[PDB]
């Protein structure tokens, strides 16, 4: 393949034209949640825009954020996710989720998905940040329990990689 230039290319331009047609908070929220589930984190559905998705995400965020301040009452900016949910309820739900997780593999996917679904502007920044920190504490603690306990060969299996090469 041949990559286009770094900061100005047809992929980013094409996504900016899609983003420009977003006209409501509901439409932009669904758009940004689908985008982040499709194209971000190690569990993304697709690497087809790998060198462009972070810039594109920022542009979606800016569009959603401006739609929020234009349309929503001030109190919703502080207390609601743009899904309609109560922000404090989302926080309590996801902290409980990860605290009930039975393994570091379950805990990692809950944390990662919380960010894919609720990263600002979806959730208010102050609520997001403290929820993200509480989740990260749990995830760090469960992963740093017997960190060296599983051999590499076992970790490769548990992660589920296809091993393509191991130098002798």
């Amino acid at each position: 393949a041949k990559r286009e230039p770094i900061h100005d290319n047809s992929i980013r331009t094409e996504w900016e034209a899609k983003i420009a047609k977003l006209t409501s908070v509901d439409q932009a929220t669904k758009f940004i949640q689908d985008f982040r589930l499709a194209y971000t984190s190690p569990f993304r559905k697709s690497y087809d825009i790998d060198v462009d998705y972070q810039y594109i995400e920022r542009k979606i965020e800016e569009k959603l954020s401006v739609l929020k301040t234009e349309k929503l009452p001030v109190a919703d900016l502080i207390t609601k996710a743009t899904t309609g949910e109560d922000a404090a309820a989302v926080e309590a739900t996801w902290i409980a989720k990860i605290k009930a997780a039975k393994s570091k593999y379950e805990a990692e996917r809950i944390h990662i998905e919380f960010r894919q679904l609720y990263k600002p502007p979806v959730l208010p920044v102050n609520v997001f940040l403290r929820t993200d920190a509480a989740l990260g504490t749990v995830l760090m603690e469960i992963r740093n329990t017997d960190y060296y306990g599983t051999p590499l060969e076992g970790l490769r299996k548990e992660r589920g990689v296809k091993v393509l090469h191991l130098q002798a």
């Binding site: 920022r58 800016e62 401006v66 301040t69 900016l77 920044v125 102050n126 940040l129 990260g136």
Partner: protein, 392 residues
């Protein structure tokens, strides 16, 4: 004879200097000698402040203004980026735009404070030799200054620590400098209040410079109840680093902080014969005005007028101001209960005098901050809300 080689300096050693001179080209290999010549200058020509500060933060292009590319090398567990857009509600076309109008990089900042550090000790050695404490009002000294000015240091201390998360989370170099310098000035204020009290202890037998009474007052006296509640919220209740800076400096400290430091302790020092306190508040008020210039550039020039997000940001700045102005009005309403304990001086501590002090504070604040972000405010309404707490 030491075990390791005594290294020959290439600048002065005849053989190494001659080898170097043979290796150095006889002409410059480029003519562009302006360090970081590509920074857009805010002023007529690039300043050394800008050269040394700007683009030190290695942001990628997906954080507005960054010149680098790609993801961070290592993120938090879960995926929080080293720096990222989720850190704040505010948006800009370029986080690097901010410029401190005092152009402080580290060196001019500590140079100026060092001047004040050394002059302060000379002033104190002379003031104790002068005996000038002899004419201060004893009730002011012991029942108002020691106790309630002492208690004010906890406000400064809390505003200082509100900057800790700002120092980690904010998104550019010039903003980080501004924030950290403002933090040190706040903890300086708290330390200087303690230094004044410890100085008076050396001159007045029986004067107790322990923080015990000041801390009890800050934590339990109704006079500071609203103030402490606001500081606790701004320091530990939020993490949006722009909200901390705005609420801290542009709302709470600019209204409550200025009233307490300048309208109460500094002004009344000069009606009760206090020749010592004005030397200390002179410093806190100079620090306030220096911080205000930087806070003003960030929130007014850069964010409230950002070509794409100005109105977006004023939506958030207006909501924050609404909330923290109500907190600060409540703080002031509690605080003016302190006038019930001071000796009445016409035009200063009576109702007309306190009303004019609140008119200066809210009137100045409306010009310096509210008018610049489009925040509507009835000055007389705020003065009357606070005067409801004034015991006639």
């Amino acid at each position: 004879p030491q075990s390791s080689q005594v290294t020959k300096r290439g600048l002065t050693d005849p053989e190494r200097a001659a080898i170097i001179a043979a290796a150095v080209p006889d002409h410059a290999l480029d003519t562009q000698r302006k360090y970081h010549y590509f920074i857009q200058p805010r002023w007529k020509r690039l300043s050394e402040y800008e050269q040394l500060s700007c683009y030190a933060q290695p942001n990628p292009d997906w954080i507005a203004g960054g010149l680098d590319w790609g993801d961070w090398t290592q993120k938090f567990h879960g995926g929080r980026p080293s720096w990222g857009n989720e850190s704040t509600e505010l948006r800009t076309t370029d986080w690097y735009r901010h410029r401190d109008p005092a152009r402080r990089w580290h060196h001019p900042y500590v140079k100026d404070k060092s001047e004040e550090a050394r002059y302060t000790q000379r002033f104190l050695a002379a003031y104790s030799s002068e005996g000038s404490i002899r004419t201060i009002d004893p009730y002011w000294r012991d029942e108002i200054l020691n106790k309630y000015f002492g208690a004010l240091l906890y406000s400064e201390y809390g505003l200082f620590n509100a900057h800790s998360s700002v120092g980690r989370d904010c998104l550019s170099d010039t903003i980080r400098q501004t924030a950290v310098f403002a933090a040190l000035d706040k903890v300086d204020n708290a330390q200087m209040i303690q230094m004044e009290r410890l100085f008076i202890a050396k001159l007045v037998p029986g004067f107790d410079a322990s923080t015990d009474v000041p801390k009890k007052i800050w934590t339990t006296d109704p006079i500071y109840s609203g103030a402490r509640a606001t500081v606790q919220e701004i320091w530990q209740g939020v993490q949006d680093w722009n909200e901390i800076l705005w609420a801290g400096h542009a709302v709470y400290d600019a209204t409550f902080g200025q009233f307490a430091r300048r309208e109460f302790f500094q002004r009344l020092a000069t009606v009760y014969g206090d020749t010592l306190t004005p030397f200390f508040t002179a410093q806190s008020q100079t620090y306030f005005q220096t911080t205000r210039g930087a806070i003003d550039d960030l929130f007014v020039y850069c964010l409230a007028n950002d070509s794409e997000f100005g109105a977006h940001n004023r939506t958030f700045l207006n909501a924050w101001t609404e909330h923290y102005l109500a907190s600060s009005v409540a703080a002031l309403k509690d605080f003016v209960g302190l006038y019930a304990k001071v000796e009445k001086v016409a035009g200063a501590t009576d109702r007309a005098g306190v009303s004019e002090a609140l008119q200066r504070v809210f009137g100045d604040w409306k010009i310096d901050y509210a008018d610049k972000i489009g925040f509507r405010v009835d000055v007389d309404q705020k003065v009357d809300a606070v005067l409801a707490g004034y015991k006639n």
